[PDB]
Design a binder for this molecule. Structure first.
Ligand SMILES: *[C@H]1O[C@H](CO)[C@H](O)[C@H](O)[C@H]1NC(C)=O
Ligand SMILES: [Ca+2]
Ligand SMILES: [Ca+2]
Lengths: 4, 229
């Protein structure tokens, strides 16, 4: 994931 | 119900409601914000909505708009959508949720009430997406029910593109045609009973999200709905  | 409106440009925003990061700028609807130097602000979402609610029982509609995607890199994110949802629908999560979903429920169709045509610039790893930029029809999930390749030439063209979105309330079919001037054309259709999903009032509008290196602008918008009886 690209989250953060 | 019967509703009609017409914005040949956004030198007027008389009936438009702005939420989250969206604002009127350069005689367009700017869906996500830019800083004082014009740089896209990361991790923001915005909605620009027609302020008055309407109903979808025994109704067909046609809407058309023009739009531009401005990118500042080869890795823009995340895109935008035209959506229908209840009138209290807020701006939801930024990034790949497109301002339309919450992370804890984004692929749970029972937990959402939103239908959209999305223009997706970033292939998300977090849920099933095609491995290319795409245009899709979303029904209660960020995982599109109907999806087609959006050519990178058109994505990065900086052209003023057109979308036509119609709903035939007899056949229960939602269709989008997307056209680029001297570029691609795109056609997607899906059978979906909107009056079943939305037995009450709804509003229509646009949602954009970052992401990074991208701003989405709506340049014109018209709409008409009519009874099927
Ligand atoms: C993570 O960040 C990328 C950009 O680096 C995209 O905005 C992507 O959509 C993000 N992932 C999620 C789940 O929002
Ligand atoms: Ca998508
Ligand atoms: Ca995506």
């Amino acid at each position: 994931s690209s989250v953060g | 119900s019967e509703l009609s409106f017409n914005y040949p440009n956004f030198q007027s925003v008389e009936d438009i409601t702005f939420q989250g990061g969206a604002s009127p700028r350069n005689e367009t609807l700017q869906l996500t914000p830019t800083d004082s130097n014009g740089i896209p602000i990361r991790q923001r979402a915005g909605h620009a909505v027609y302020s008055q609610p309407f109903q979808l029982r025994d109704t067909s509609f046609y809407t058309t708009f023009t739009f531009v995607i401005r990118t500042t890199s080869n890795s823009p994110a995340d895109g935008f959508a035209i959506f229908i949802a209840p009138p209290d629908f807020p701006v939801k999560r930024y990034g790949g949720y497109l301002g339309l979903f919450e992370p804890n429920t984004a692929t749970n169709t029972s937990a959402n009430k939103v239908v959209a045509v999305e223009f997706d610039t970033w292939v998300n790893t977090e849920w099933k997406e095609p491995r290319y930029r795409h245009i899709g029809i979303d029904v209660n999930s960020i995982v599109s029910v109907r999806v087609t390749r959006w050519q990178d030439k058109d994505v990065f063209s900086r052209s003023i593109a057109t979308a036509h979105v119609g709903y035939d309330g007899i056949s229960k079919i939602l269709t989008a045609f997307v056209t680029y001037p001297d570029g691609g054309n795109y056609v997607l259709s899906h059978v979906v009973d909107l009056a079943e999903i939305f037995p009450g009032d709804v509003r229509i509008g646009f949602s954009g999200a970052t992401g990074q290196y991208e701003t989405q602008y709506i340049h014109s918008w018209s709409f008409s709905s009519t009874s099927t009886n």
